[PDB]
Enzyme design. Structure first.
Site, PDB file in Angstrom:
ATOM      1  N   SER A  39       0.824  -1.205   0.000  1.00 32.69           N
ATOM      2  CA  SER A  39       0.000   0.000   0.000  1.00 32.69           C
ATOM      3  C   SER A  39       0.871   1.275   0.000  1.00 32.69           C
ATOM      4  O   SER A  39       0.888   1.950   1.060  1.00 32.69           O
ATOM      5  CB  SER A  39      -0.677   0.039   1.393  1.00 32.69           C
ATOM      6  OG  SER A  39      -2.031  -0.192   1.174  1.00 32.69           O
ATOM      7  N   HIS A 159      -3.632  -6.109   1.777  1.00 32.43           N
ATOM      8  CA  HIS A 159      -2.872  -7.001   2.665  1.00 32.43           C
ATOM      9  C   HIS A 159      -3.290  -8.460   2.661  1.00 32.43           C
ATOM     10  O   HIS A 159      -2.641  -9.349   3.246  1.00 32.43           O
ATOM     11  CB  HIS A 159      -2.845  -6.512   4.160  1.00 32.43           C
ATOM     12  CG  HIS A 159      -1.903  -5.333   4.282  1.00 32.43           C
ATOM     13  ND1 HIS A 159      -1.955  -4.322   5.213  1.00 32.43           N
ATOM     14  CD2 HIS A 159      -1.076  -4.884   3.273  1.00 32.43           C
ATOM     15  CE1 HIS A 159      -1.159  -3.339   4.817  1.00 32.43           C
ATOM     16  NE2 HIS A 159      -0.675  -3.639   3.622  1.00 32.43           N
ATOM     17  N   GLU A 168      -6.909  -2.650   7.120  1.00 35.19           N
ATOM     18  CA  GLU A 168      -6.567  -3.056   8.476  1.00 35.19           C
ATOM     19  C   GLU A 168      -7.646  -2.816   9.508  1.00 35.19           C
ATOM     20  O   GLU A 168      -8.207  -1.695   9.606  1.00 35.19           O
ATOM     21  CB  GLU A 168      -5.278  -2.366   8.981  1.00 35.19           C
ATOM     22  CG  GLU A 168      -4.094  -2.224   7.987  1.00 35.19           C
ATOM     23  CD  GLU A 168      -2.868  -1.573   8.572  1.00 35.19           C
ATOM     24  OE1 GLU A 168      -2.854  -1.010   9.657  1.00 35.19           O
ATOM     25  OE2 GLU A 168      -1.832  -1.664   7.867  1.00 35.19           O
ATOM     26  N   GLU A 211       0.184  -9.259   7.206  1.00 33.83           N
ATOM     27  CA  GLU A 211       0.584  -8.710   8.506  1.00 33.83           C
ATOM     28  C   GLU A 211       0.181  -9.576   9.664  1.00 33.83           C
ATOM     29  O   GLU A 211       0.208  -9.183  10.862  1.00 33.83           O
ATOM     30  CB  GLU A 211       0.100  -7.251   8.654  1.00 33.83           C
ATOM     31  CG  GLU A 211       0.684  -6.303   7.593  1.00 33.83           C
ATOM     32  CD  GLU A 211       0.489  -4.842   7.876  1.00 33.83           C
ATOM     33  OE1 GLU A 211      -0.412  -4.410   8.603  1.00 33.83           O
ATOM     34  OE2 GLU A 211       1.408  -4.060   7.520  1.00 33.83           O
ATOM     35  N   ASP A 246      -7.439   1.253   9.540  1.00 32.36           N
ATOM     36  CA  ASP A 246      -6.593   1.817   8.492  1.00 32.36           C
ATOM     37  C   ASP A 246      -7.428   1.574   7.227  1.00 32.36           C
ATOM     38  O   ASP A 246      -7.427   0.375   6.905  1.00 32.36           O
ATOM     39  CB  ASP A 246      -5.169   1.323   8.417  1.00 32.36           C
ATOM     40  CG  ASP A 246      -4.362   1.902   7.250  1.00 32.36           C
ATOM     41  OD1 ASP A 246      -4.883   2.716   6.468  1.00 32.36           O
ATOM     42  OD2 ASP A 246      -3.236   1.396   6.999  1.00 32.36           O
ATOM     43  N   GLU A 295      -7.124   5.813  10.247  1.00 30.27           N
ATOM     44  CA  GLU A 295      -5.964   6.239   9.444  1.00 30.27           C
ATOM     45  C   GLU A 295      -6.321   6.188   7.973  1.00 30.27           C
ATOM     46  O   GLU A 295      -7.011   5.259   7.462  1.00 30.27           O
ATOM     47  CB  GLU A 295      -4.819   5.235   9.633  1.00 30.27           C
ATOM     48  CG  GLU A 295      -3.551   5.441   8.821  1.00 30.27           C
ATOM     49  CD  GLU A 295      -2.640   4.268   8.869  1.00 30.27           C
ATOM     50  OE1 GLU A 295      -2.726   3.486   9.853  1.00 30.27           O
ATOM     51  OE2 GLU A 295      -1.882   4.014   7.943  1.00 30.27           O
ATOM     52  N   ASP A 320      -1.077   8.832   6.600  1.00 32.97           N
ATOM     53  CA  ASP A 320      -0.067   7.842   6.227  1.00 32.97           C
ATOM     54  C   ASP A 320       0.405   8.228   4.822  1.00 32.97           C
ATOM     55  O   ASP A 320       1.532   8.665   4.645  1.00 32.97           O
ATOM     56  CB  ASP A 320      -0.643   6.431   6.345  1.00 32.97           C
ATOM     57  CG  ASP A 320       0.316   5.383   5.807  1.00 32.97           C
ATOM     58  OD1 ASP A 320       1.413   5.774   5.325  1.00 32.97           O
ATOM     59  OD2 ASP A 320      -0.016   4.209   5.684  1.00 32.97           O
ATOM     60  N   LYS A 345       7.010   6.388   9.059  1.00 40.52           N
ATOM     61  CA  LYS A 345       7.647   5.333   8.273  1.00 40.52           C
ATOM     62  C   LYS A 345       8.969   5.790   7.660  1.00 40.52           C
ATOM     63  O   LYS A 345       9.041   6.290   6.507  1.00 40.52           O
ATOM     64  CB  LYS A 345       6.676   4.821   7.204  1.00 40.52           C
ATOM     65  CG  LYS A 345       5.424   4.025   7.693  1.00 40.52           C
ATOM     66  CD  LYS A 345       4.456   3.967   6.508  1.00 40.52           C
ATOM     67  CE  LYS A 345       3.246   3.042   6.585  1.00 40.52           C
ATOM     68  NZ  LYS A 345       2.403   3.160   5.356  1.00 40.52           N
ATOM     69  N   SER A 372       5.227   2.967  12.515  1.00 38.51           N
ATOM     70  CA  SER A 372       4.625   1.784  11.906  1.00 38.51           C
ATOM     71  C   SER A 372       5.669   0.983  11.155  1.00 38.51           C
ATOM     72  O   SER A 372       6.692   1.550  10.765  1.00 38.51           O
ATOM     73  CB  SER A 372       3.533   2.249  10.919  1.00 38.51           C
ATOM     74  OG  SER A 372       3.943   1.937   9.630  1.00 38.51           O
ATOM     75  N   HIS A 373       5.389  -0.315  11.086  1.00 42.48           N
ATOM     76  CA  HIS A 373       6.149  -1.183  10.184  1.00 42.48           C
ATOM     77  C   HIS A 373       5.680  -0.860   8.732  1.00 42.48           C
ATOM     78  O   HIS A 373       4.917   0.120   8.503  1.00 42.48           O
ATOM     79  CB  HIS A 373       5.756  -2.645  10.492  1.00 42.48           C
ATOM     80  CG  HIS A 373       4.299  -2.954  10.363  1.00 42.48           C
ATOM     81  ND1 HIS A 373       3.293  -2.053  10.167  1.00 42.48           N
ATOM     82  CD2 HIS A 373       3.701  -4.179  10.218  1.00 42.48           C
ATOM     83  CE1 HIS A 373       2.135  -2.625  10.151  1.00 42.48           C
ATOM     84  NE2 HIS A 373       2.394  -3.908  10.072  1.00 42.48           N
ATOM     85  N   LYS A 396       2.293   0.685  15.528  1.00 44.29           N
ATOM     86  CA  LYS A 396       1.637  -0.287  14.632  1.00 44.29           C
ATOM     87  C   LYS A 396       2.665  -1.212  14.001  1.00 44.29           C
ATOM     88  O   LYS A 396       3.525  -0.913  13.188  1.00 44.29           O
ATOM     89  CB  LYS A 396       0.647   0.382  13.747  1.00 44.29           C
ATOM     90  CG  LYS A 396       1.021   0.770  12.374  1.00 44.29           C
ATOM     91  CD  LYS A 396      -0.283   0.882  11.581  1.00 44.29           C
ATOM     92  CE  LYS A 396       0.073   0.863  10.080  1.00 44.29           C
ATOM     93  NZ  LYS A 396      -1.229   1.129   9.383  1.00 44.29           N
TER      94      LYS A 396
END
Ligand SMILES: O=C(O)[C@@H](CO)OP(=O)(O)O
Ligand SMILES: [Li+]
Ligand SMILES: [Mg+2]
Ligand SMILES: [Mg+2]
Lengths: 436, 436
Positions: A39, A159, A168, A211, A246, A295, A320, A345, A372-373, A396
């Site tokens: 994403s 995802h 998410e 994830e 998300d 988000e 994001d 990020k 976040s990852h 996250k």
């Protein structure tokens, strides 16, 4: 003291190739692994890929690695820079590239040299990585702030496979008193959620997305949320657990319109929702469920929808894709008054220094920061140290499943245990953990 | 010398609690994370779980963790044991416990100290862990042998919902010239396969199970075999990638016999098979497909049918549950001429020295050894080192997805690069990498 810089290709948690950077000094070898997103926002710094169709279906990173070994290294090493001076480190990489977007070396060549340098500097000073990061970003360290984990339990969109649009669905244990407890609570919910999922959706429904969240072939958000609240209830933690979303909207933005009925290369020029339309739906879910954060409720550049919604929401609103960890895009959002939280990020911007400034510009504006990852993660645990160093009170990093996620969560348990009494769990104060 | 022994509870790839041990010496802090299987053999050394239904549904390891901290630690430290002396370290641990199944302190409490001391020993000697594991093993080291990865691509049986009863389907890129090329090959097939699967079975069919392989509702073994060989061809790797199978036979061993549709539930009795019966399907598949290894073809005590089959199988036949990494069941097997390869699961036995004797006894008897992961894995990469240490020429550590599986495989990349000219890829000679 840096005597060599070196890259190699390793695998991310999907199986795609990624860059790993090793930096050697008199104190040892410091290694960094760069993550990879699915994403990804249009405005992210450039991730370079080989495009050689035979090898890795064109996803190898042998060019970014070569850049590290052939371009940055020789020159990094001859500038004999102080790794403790993160700014000078990055200023150096940034000008070797000489582009707005890290389109000449690739964000994926730069980051790992950035990150491994902070590791090498923590080592020179005989402190834990999170302590050095606190130094750099000039955060308060008495006490240190243990973050609320936003665990992705039910994976959708980009995802996972199936119908579901919202990417998410997270649970946040803000009612726990410690991080060990918030993790215990979160995995309990997750094992119940899983169990409920197979009961109702069959065994297959039980497998996981990228994830680590379960990915049932669910059609609506409501169905997803009802399931999750049955799971919280079932685990016995009603009240101690909140929800975060998300929507990854950008992935489904088409004209001033939003397509929920997709991932479905034919159905229907009419599921398609307008922005107010979509705002409206968010306000529905909101009255119904314990949502405390949303988000990317609107696309990357649909500035007007953000502001409009932001006026009425009264919950955290994370950027994001709108901001992509970029101080320049962040300034506009603060100005348009679109959000109140930054999704941090390091690989959206490409350097540690630019990622700290983004955090400092957000905190300055009265905003939260959620580290976040990426959906394509690694065994690397950097962000575990970073969220504590930055005093944000929120992270996250995936479901409590798949070790590219648990590696960060396991790192937080050890840090907690280490800081003993000089640490505090963010809990219900996650939004502004810097100001604890 | 060892100044402290300490344990904590961390999480595995499934989000279940497990034990992490930290061993302190003058050289630093060495840690271990113990894995945890899902599958198992009745005869396995005992993992200690709390059985507190109020925490982690009864899966806590607090008691194991307290055993380390309160029982082992003081004594281990007072004993002043030479950590380079692995047998001494382990003899010590086994006596402290006193039961034939490590049921007093718990194999998870023990294993952690055992693995951690091998890391602390390696450091004092200043050799990479693999080289010290070579030492302990009495293995050849000119060259060192890199293993053929057995990659899980697709699951059946209890992992999934069709009718297929066989459990793991693996690919083995034997044809490759290096580890690095074998992993590349391995991951291009994996990705092809996930494509095929979503096209032929639906988007949800691409979600992954515990070890990263997909699990679509398949009807027959052939149906599974054909999807795999199509994937091989789609990728262009025809002729370089073999197939390995994990039957996990016990699973449908309905006392009398072998219940294929164990997933029945309206359990078609009488139409349940006897060794010699199952043995023919096996044979049949071997003639149509490039199978090179079959694991747990018959149940863990049905010694009867192992010998029976072994007579004419002509491919590697792997003992997992039948042996449980125990030098007691290996002897029988060897004596019975039941299989020719051991799957090596350290936590099945509980100590590093017992795992090494077990591998040593196999090699003695002329068998191969497939070091192996567990379904509940961690970020620890111990088995990477161990497989290069023992020179087995084959490993099974999961799909090229999820990083509790890639950590090991990424770790074999770094190793292969570190040995340069001192190493060789097992290739086609995997069944006997020790005698290479
Ligand atoms: O949308 C996101 O926030 C992230 C993380 O879960 O996903 P990706 O890395 O694929 O952008
Ligand atoms: Li994203
Ligand atoms: Mg996002
Ligand atoms: Mg098995």
């Amino acid at each position: 003291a840096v005597s060599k810089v070196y890259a190699r290709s390793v695998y991310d948690s999907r199986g795609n190739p990624t860059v790993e950077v090793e930096l050697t000094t008199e104190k040892g070898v410091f290694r960094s692994i760069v993550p990879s997103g699915a994403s990804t926002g249009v405005h992210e710094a450039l991730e370079m890929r080989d495009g050689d169709k035979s090898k890795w279906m064109g996803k190898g990173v042998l060019h970014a690695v070569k850049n590290v070994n052939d371009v940055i290294a020789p020159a990094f090493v001859k500038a004999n820079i102080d790794v403790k001076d993160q700014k000078a480190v990055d200023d150096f990489l940034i000008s070797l590239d000489g582009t707005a977007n890290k389109s000449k070396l690739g964000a994926n060549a730069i980051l790992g040299v950035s990150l491994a340098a902070s590791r090498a500097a923590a080592a020179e000073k005989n402190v834990p990585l999170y302590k050095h990061l606190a130094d750099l970003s000039k955060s308060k360290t008495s006490p240190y702030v243990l973050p609320v984990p936003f665990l992705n339990v039910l994976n959708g969109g980009s995802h996972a496979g199936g119908a579901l649009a919202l990417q998410e669905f997270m649970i946040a244990p803000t009612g726990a008193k410690t991080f060990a407890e918030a993790l215990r609570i979160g995995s309990e919910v997750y094992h119940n959620l899983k169990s409920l999922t197979k009961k109702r959706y069959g065994a297959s429904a039980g497998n996981v997305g990228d994830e680590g969240g379960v990915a049932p072939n669910i059609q609506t958000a409501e169905e997803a949320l009802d399931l999750i609240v049955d799971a919280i209830k079932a685990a016995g933690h009603d009240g101690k657990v909140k929800i975060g979303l998300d929507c990854a909207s950008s992935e489904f933005f088409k004209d001033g319109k939003y397509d929920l009925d997709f991932k479905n290369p034919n159905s229907d020029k009419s599921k398609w929702l307008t922005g107010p339309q979509l705002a409206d739906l968010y306000h529905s879910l909101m009255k119904r469920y314990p949502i405390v954060s949303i988000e990317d409720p609107f696309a990357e550049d649909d500035w007007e929808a953000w502001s409009h919604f932001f006026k009425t929401a009264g919950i955290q609103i994370v950027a994001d894709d709108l901001t992509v960890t970029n101080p320049k895009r962040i300034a506009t959002a603060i100005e348009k008054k679109a959000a109140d939280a930054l999704l941090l990020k390091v690989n959206q911007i490409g350097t540690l220094s630019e990622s700290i400034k983004a955090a400092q510009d957000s905190f300055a504006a009265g905003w939260g920061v959620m580290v976040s990852h990426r959906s394509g993660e690694t065994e690397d645990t950097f962000i575990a140290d970073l969220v504590v160093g930055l005093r944000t009170g929120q992270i996250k990093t995936g479901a409590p499943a798949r070790s590219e996620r648990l590696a960060k969560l396991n790192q937080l348990l050890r840090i907690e245990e280490e800081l003993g009494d000089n640490a505090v769990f963010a809990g219900e104060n996650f939004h502004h953990g810097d100001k604890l």
